[PDB]
Design a protein around this ligand. Structure first.
Ligand SMILES: *[C@@H]1O[C@H](CO)[C@@H](O[C@@H]2O[C@H](CO)[C@@H](O)[C@H](O)[C@H]2NC(C)=O)[C@H](O)[C@H]1NC(C)=O
Ligand SMILES: *[C@@H]1O[C@H](CO)[C@@H](O[C@@H]2O[C@H](CO)[C@@H](O)[C@H](O)[C@H]2NC(C)=O)[C@H](O)[C@H]1NC(C)=O
Ligand SMILES: *[C@@H]1O[C@H](CO)[C@@H](O[C@@H]2O[C@H](CO)[C@@H](O)[C@H](O)[C@H]2NC(C)=O)[C@H](O)[C@H]1NC(C)=O
Ligand SMILES: *[C@@H]1O[C@H](CO)[C@@H](O[C@@H]2O[C@H](CO)[C@@H](O)[C@H](O)[C@H]2NC(C)=O)[C@H](O)[C@H]1NC(C)=O
Ligand SMILES: CCNCc1nc2c(N)nc3ccccc3c2n1CC(C)(C)O
Ligand SMILES: CCNCc1nc2c(N)nc3ccccc3c2n1CC(C)(C)O
Ligand SMILES: *[C@@H]1O[C@H](CO)[C@@H](O)[C@H](O)[C@H]1NC(C)=O
Ligand SMILES: *[C@@H]1O[C@H](CO)[C@@H](O)[C@H](O)[C@H]1NC(C)=O
Ligand SMILES: *[C@@H]1O[C@H](CO)[C@@H](O)[C@H](O)[C@H]1NC(C)=O
Ligand SMILES: *[C@@H]1O[C@H](CO)[C@@H](O)[C@H](O)[C@H]1NC(C)=O
Ligand SMILES: *[C@@H]1O[C@H](CO)[C@@H](O)[C@H](O)[C@H]1NC(C)=O
Ligand SMILES: *[C@@H]1O[C@H](CO)[C@@H](O)[C@H](O)[C@H]1NC(C)=O
Ligand SMILES: *[C@@H]1O[C@H](CO)[C@@H](O)[C@H](O)[C@H]1NC(C)=O
Ligand SMILES: *[C@@H]1O[C@H](CO)[C@@H](O)[C@H](O)[C@H]1NC(C)=O
Ligand SMILES: *[C@@H]1O[C@H](CO)[C@@H](O)[C@H](O)[C@H]1NC(C)=O
Ligand SMILES: *[C@@H]1O[C@H](CO)[C@@H](O)[C@H](O)[C@H]1NC(C)=O
Ligand SMILES: *[C@@H]1O[C@H](CO)[C@@H](O)[C@H](O)[C@H]1NC(C)=O
Lengths: 772, 772
């Protein structure tokens, strides 16, 4: 199928439309730039290798390069692997880049460089030098960058990559960069705003530095600026997860009342962790276009009850005031200034970490007539009391977020406290109105708790303390609810009428409710599904279910059942036939996950007990030591079979004789040491096959007929025990010449032997002596 | 050191005092009895192999055998491995046992035998034939057993090993076994009590059968019987975890009032799962000695309120009345008859599964003057209300068990419901008075909850819903408490005064309280230990701890800290020095478990930050990819180092130069491929070394000096990658001749190659061609 096998250890992709030739050698354990890179290459990526040097030889033939991505070949010690430390900084020899007349983007982040690389071609639009050791910026070193438009210099002096001095920037070092639009000097030990900056700037990132004061004219000429981030200058250090040094005298970042007067195009202003105690209204007198304001992690608790500056922000879309509470103070209630009602455009309001005992409806009246408000986030406030009926006046909202509180009758998990959320490395909302009560202290629920909340589409009760026999009465008002997340509670399924009042429920999650399933003698009605007439997906993972009072689960609607992390091995104890049809009467079930059920064997009868339309079956991670492949004939609609992470040792003699429907067969991480002689014969309908991480030594053509292989959408073979003897000649030739997608050919499709060939890639194997 | 290497794949022990030669071939994957078993062998065990036959050659030379243990070489299908099913039942040829003039004990359980083996020697005292296929007992087949005292015939016809007919016993089949003391016919589909039985019987096991009625004279002659078990005849089938057929019309096992009149020596009567509705006092008229009565899994709920029979049981030690509740009945309270007060000798009372809402002090008054009472078990009753102060009248008890209830302001976990708790296979009580409130619904606690309970030594609150900031006030009456189990709650360690009122506390378990450690920005005072002045052991496993407001834990008493299952990798983020001394001021800490903390590397400063008297350190299961062995020099008292289940690839060049104190070094399940040339040179304090489950190919003599090997109590080497070439000549010879204890030589110290030798045990390897 190929006359010239590809030996290059990189992926090569063809973007005919914009004439791009993409060569991606990411994470190929290279110690040199590989030979034979195509001369037409436009995008060359060498990220995460151990190439110690660049020289004119490096890209000599590659005159068409628009982008070199050479990140993280020598990353700073505390940021990189401690098992493969980089011994010496990347060495760049003169005029390695000057021949590349078309080069627009150069990424050299994370190479321990000491100076800005010189000799760069004047076509360059983007230069990236994050996580190097460059902490002095001189005008002279920037002359080469006349046409530069995006310049990243951050992370060159901070606690994970120290330079032990203040960052240095020469007066007007950036000024004659007349095209520069984005400048990022974050995480750099910078002490003053650099001046004068070019008025072309649209984005300026100065956050996480040691700037104590803003001068009146620091931003005087920047009439095109759209994003300004000054966060983390004079940080609020309480409970900081990183080493945190505050400004002296509990000082805030000092910003003169007129400092932003020139910023008429500013759409985003970030003032997170600046220890602000006041927000002067005068700041925003000439900014009418501001859309996003971040004021989290300051000391604005009292300002929130006053907040006159809000009257100047009628175009604001997002307001963040999270974590402004006064230390050691547990307020009685939330005091929102009436000025919030002048925020006519607000869609997102976040006030986590205000820290107060009781929320009452009148406290939210300033928001009552904000017509665009879509998200109200009051998480992590330790609220003990809130009458949920209160939110009848907020039907228009998409998400009401009370997550992580103490109520009783999606942002990353580190978000407000992490050092740099934007550091670069080397859900039920769509169903409609969401009330998120997850991670609260709700121990008991009753219908009145949800009075006037009939409009709700998703209710998140995950991680409460609900330890209750539901009988169909607790959710009566929730007549529109489509999604209930009830995971991490203590559901007691005594009654098969549980949840039946949720007559429009489509998704139910009762995962991690194992408490009552763990003790003998307790009644469990797993047939509670019959009463849920539009239920589409049921999750009951990690419930430790090893017994059931009912012997069948019933549903004519359910299409997906997740049953992972239970004890079907106990339910299907050999000799006990009573539960072999547990799933049989889920007539429209197509996907069944019964991985992690300690199923070391399948008793006869489980396959005949499967419902008739089963399409996706997972039996992964069961410790399965044997498997009657012929029993797959009962599964007449089977398309995906996941047998990964087991102890299987054989494949079927004729996959076509076991299932002439199967498309995806996943056998990774088993103990298979050989294939049957006619394994895939006539298995035409097959499209995806994972044999990786087994012990296969040989594969002959009879097992892998090409009438089958070339309609394979992927074939995974890596991490086996291939023996590269003259018996392997067909397999080696076929692998070298096939166009079927096989991952990790360059890195993990390897001979274990004999001796000479140990560790050698099958792709590079020369077997001419077999033909002499 | 040995002139004749042992090649026999069995363990051989010498018990010089009792003149025993013990040969243990348990689970050696033998398909034949090995040659060369010592002629003096007295105890031979071949359990769990695949030896298909026994013949006169089997034990030909072994005339001194007192015991043959040949269990489970062909186990019934539903009881055995489905990956290695036994193809044909064990074959015993004639006269295989008659030459064994001293044979006292013969175990042939689980071999699918069809008849009682004939030709047995007249010395035999014990025959065991459980889990075979013998379901007709004839007097003729028993004549050979004249001297038998112990006969196990159960598990030959039941749902896990069906015979599809009723068990058959000939009239007086057992009568002429005049020495028989123990007869077990459990799990056999028996339909009547066999008669007449020999009057020597002391123990009769007839449980899990199909006996519907006892005849009035079925036990008439058994004036020596001490234990009678008739349980599981007419079973109580509700929520049974095995296929269960009740007698119909809800009939009980029918027992005439005089059926026990002859059993004057009876000490144990088991009537579990017999569907009893009454316990006639007349049953016990001539049983004056009964000590143990099991009446669990009947329908005695109403009888418990009357219970006139208890007046005839003044010597009873143990009474079990668990799971007698009426189906679908949730009683208001528990009604214990006054007759319980006549149980003068009672030590243990178990009444689980009575199922009632409210426990109150007056309900237990019949027990107030039972002076010998030690255990009151009221678990699994769904009690919602209980004033714990009532147990002030129960200071003499050792354990008050309210586990698994719904209270709100040690038996196996399958015990009452499993089919045969005695089926054979092929904790804080010690501190004093214990109140076990585990697995209840306690969400909030206050001091008054423990009013009058100052005598308690151990309190188990595990698995409740306590989601509360403790501040030192909640446990004030518990002035003698030595052990608090607070695991699986939702501890909020806001205050460093938590638990400080428990001034005699020695052990605290706060494991699996991860809830509030999972959300960012929440204050955690891990320095709460300072106030606990006699605390010896602290468990805080599986708390997901990744942040702390305090930087150090402090204690003058703590000796053991379990800190497993947290995120020290995040706390010790490279470049953040603030937590590197978290444990430094636990000045008396001797044991530290920080396994499972995602520590893929150890930041420098961790070892210098350890407290000075640390002796046992676990770093297991961390994904550790590298390790600076020289840093062990900081741990001048280190004796045990557990690095198991990591990714290490090297050992130190000279262990003695890293730690002068190290005695136990555990390196199992790593990636070590070779040892350093002088690894163990002069490591004179080393005593235990585990290198199993690595990738070692070769070991040379320089690495293993003999003056060090002579002090090793164990050296574990199994499951490596040994290369059995002429280069391995020292190691192969040394392994064959050493006296150092090396486990699994017979089974898992194996050549991986070259070719001819794959799978061969190095103990069997012949390398003479290397020496020609
Ligand atoms: C190949 O490299 C070019 C050069 O950087 C990439 O083109 C840039 O793509 C971003 C994505 O929107 C644009 O903002 C830049 O303006 C583009 N620059 C030019 C000169 O066109 C391109 O994305 C890369 N393609 C791949 C597949 O890596
Ligand atoms: C940021 O710059 C400060 C100084 O502006 C550095 O602090 C100095 O560090 C040296 C070397 O450790 C000390 O000897 C001086 O006493 C420090 N001076 C002051 C004024 O603090 C600091 O190390 C730099 N931070 C990083 C992360 O590189
Ligand atoms: C070796 O076999 C003898 C004979 O079966 C065992 O001796 C019996 O041990 C039990 C347990 O202590 C006693 O109750 C019996 O009284 C002993 N004698 C008989 C005739 O059964 C002995 O325990 C075995 N030893 C080992 C190490 O297996
Ligand atoms: C226990 O004995 C009964 C008979 O006393 C067995 O039941 C019979 O089984 C055969 C074949 O399965 C049926 O055709 C009969 O109808 C059954 N008879 C009755 C009276 O039910 C039963 O199989 C035996 N149990 C075991 C585990 O062997
Ligand atoms: C040993 C009990 N077995 C049956 C049983 N199961 C449960 C259960 N899951 N939850 C409960 C919650 C409250 C009260 C009782 C139960 C209960 N009961 C007892 C009864 C309702 C009479 O069936
Ligand atoms: C945003 C969190 N700031 C630190 C904090 N942690 C906790 C905690 N673990 N538990 C609590 C329980 C009740 C009320 C408050 C807290 C609380 N607070 C707030 C503080 C003012 C210090 O009390
Ligand atoms: C809220 O705070 C504001 C300003 O700090 C002030 O009007 C008043 O003290 C508070 N009002 C209420 C109703 O609590
Ligand atoms: C909660 O508020 C609603 C107002 O919609 C009211 O109907 C209900 O009585 C209140 N409940 C409590 C417990 O205050
Ligand atoms: C419910 O909230 C939990 C806890 O934050 C979250 O992990 C989960 O994804 C949410 N469920 C849905 C369906 O969004
Ligand atoms: C369900 O339980 C609720 C809550 O206690 C109760 O009001 C109602 O009577 C019960 N309904 C049924 C049908 O059992
Ligand atoms: C589920 O099975 C139990 C078994 O007794 C039965 O009581 C109940 O009627 C069944 N489920 C229904 C009716 O949804
Ligand atoms: C308890 O039940 C027994 C049995 O019916 C009855 O005789 C007795 O009067 C009851 N006593 C109480 C206090 O309920
Ligand atoms: C519990 O009983 C004790 C009697 O020892 C009494 O002092 C206390 O008031 C009772 N508590 C409650 C809540 O009834
Ligand atoms: C407390 O009870 C739990 C739950 O039953 C049990 O697992 C644990 O071992 C008990 N703790 C002690 C110290 O006995
Ligand atoms: C500790 O909490 C208890 C329970 O609310 C309270 O009574 C007590 O005053 C608190 N003590 C301190 C010192 O805050
Ligand atoms: C624990 O350490 C913190 C330091 O963050 C301090 O506020 C507190 O007083 C300390 N408490 C004790 C008991 O040492
Ligand atoms: C390790 O060995 C070197 C060289 O023999 C010696 O100088 C050094 O003191 C030793 N260190 C320890 C801790 O034994």
């Amino acid at each position: 199928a190929r006359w010239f096998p590809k030996t290059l250890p990189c992926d090569v992709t063809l973007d005919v439309s914009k004439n791009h030739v993409i060569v991606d050698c990411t994470d190929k354990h290279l110690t040199e730039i590989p030979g034979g890179i195509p001369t037409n290459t436009t995008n060359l990526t060498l990220t995460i290798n151990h190439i110690p040097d660049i020289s004119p030889a490096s890209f000599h033939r590659l005159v068409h390069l628009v982008e070199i991505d050479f990140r993280c070949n020598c990353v700073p010690i505390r940021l990189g692997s401690k098992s493969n430390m980089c011994p010496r900084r990347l060495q760049i020899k003169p005029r390695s880049f000057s021949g590349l007349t078309y080069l627009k983007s150069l990424y050299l982040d994370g190479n321990q460089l000491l100076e800005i690389p010189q000799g760069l071609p004047p076509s360059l639009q983007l230069l990236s030098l994050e996580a190097n050791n460059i902490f002095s910026i001189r005008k002279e070193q920037l002359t080469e960058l006349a046409n530069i438009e995006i310049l990243y210099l951050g992370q060159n002096c901070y606690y994970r990559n120290p330079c032990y001095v203040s960052y240095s920037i020469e007066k007007d070092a950036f000024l004659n960069l007349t095209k520069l639009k984005v400048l990022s000097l974050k995480d750099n030990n910078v002490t003053t705003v650099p001046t004068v900056l070019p008025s072309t700037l649209t984005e300026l990132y100065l956050y996480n530095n040691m700037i104590a004061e803003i001068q009146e004219d620091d931003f005087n000429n920047l009439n095109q600026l759209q994003i300004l981030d000054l966060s983390g200058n004079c940080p609020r250090c309480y409970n900081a997860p990183f080493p945190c040094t505050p400004c002296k005298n509990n000082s805030p970042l000092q910003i003169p009342v007129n400092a932003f007067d020139a910023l008429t195009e500013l759409k985003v202003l970030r003032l997170h962790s600046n220890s602000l105690q006041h927000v002067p209204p005068r700041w925003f007198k000439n900014i009418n276009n501001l859309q996003e304001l971040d004021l989290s992690q300051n000391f604005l608790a009292k300002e929130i009850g006053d907040a006159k500056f809000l009257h100047f922000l009628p175009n604001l879309i997002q307001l963040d005031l999270s974590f402004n509470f006064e230390l050691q103070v547990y307020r009685a209630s939330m005091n929102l200034s009436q000025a919030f009602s002048s925020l006519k455009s607000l869609k997102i309001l976040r006030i986590r970490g205000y820290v107060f005992k009781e929320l009452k409806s009148f406290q939210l009246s300033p928001l009552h007539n904000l017509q665009n408000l879509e998200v109200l986030d009051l998480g992590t406030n330790f609220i003990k009391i809130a009458n949920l009926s209160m939110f009848k006046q907020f039907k228009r909202l998409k998400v009401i977020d009370l997550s992580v509180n103490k109520i009783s009758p999606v942002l990353e998990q580190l978000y407000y406290f992490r050092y740099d959320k934007y550091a670069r490395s080397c859900s039920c909302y769509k169903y409609g109105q969401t009330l998120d009560l997850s991670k609260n202290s709700i121990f008991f629920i009753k219908s009145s708790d949800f009075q006037h909340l009939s409009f709700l589409k998703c209710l998140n009760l995950s991680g409460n303390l609900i330890s209750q026999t539901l009988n169909g009465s607790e959710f009566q008002p929730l007549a529109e609810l489509r999604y209930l997340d009830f995971s991490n509670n203590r559901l007691d399924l005594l009654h098969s009428t549980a949840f039946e009042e949720l007559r429009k429920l489509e998704v139910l999650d009762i995962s991690s409710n194992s408490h009552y399933f763990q003790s003998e003698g307790i009644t469990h009605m797993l047939n509670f599904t019959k009463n849920l007439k539009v239920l589409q997906k049921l999750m009951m993972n990690d419930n430790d279910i090893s017994s059931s009072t009912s012997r069948t689960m019933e549903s004519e609607s359910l299409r997906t059942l997740e049953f992972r992390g239970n004890h079907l091995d106990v339910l299907w104890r050999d000799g006990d036939n009573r539960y072999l049809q547990l799933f049989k009467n889920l007539l429209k079930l197509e996907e069944l996950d019964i991985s992690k059920n300690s199923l070391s064997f399948l008793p006869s009868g489980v396959f005949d007990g499967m419902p008739p339309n089963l399409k996706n079956l997972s039996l992964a991670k069961n410790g399965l030591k044997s498997f009657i492949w012929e029993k797959l004939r009962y599964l007449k609609n089977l398309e995906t079979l996941d047998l990964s992470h087991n102890q299987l040792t054989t494949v079927p003699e004729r996959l076509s004789n076991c299932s002439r429907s199967l498309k995806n067969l996943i056998l990774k991480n088993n103990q298979i040491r050989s294939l049957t002689k006619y394994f895939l014969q006539d298995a035409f309908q097959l499209r995806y096959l994972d044999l990786s991480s087994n012990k296969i030594q040989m594969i002959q053509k009879t097992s892998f007929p090409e009438n089958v292989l070339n309609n394979l959408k992927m074939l995974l073979l890596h991490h086996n025990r291939f023996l590269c003897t003259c018996d392997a000649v067909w397999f080696v030739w076929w692998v070298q010449h096939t166009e079927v997608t096989i991952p990790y050919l360059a890195t993990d499709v390897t001979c274990v032997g004999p001796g000479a060939h140990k560790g050698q890639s099958v792709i590079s194997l020369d077997l001419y002596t077999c033909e002499l």
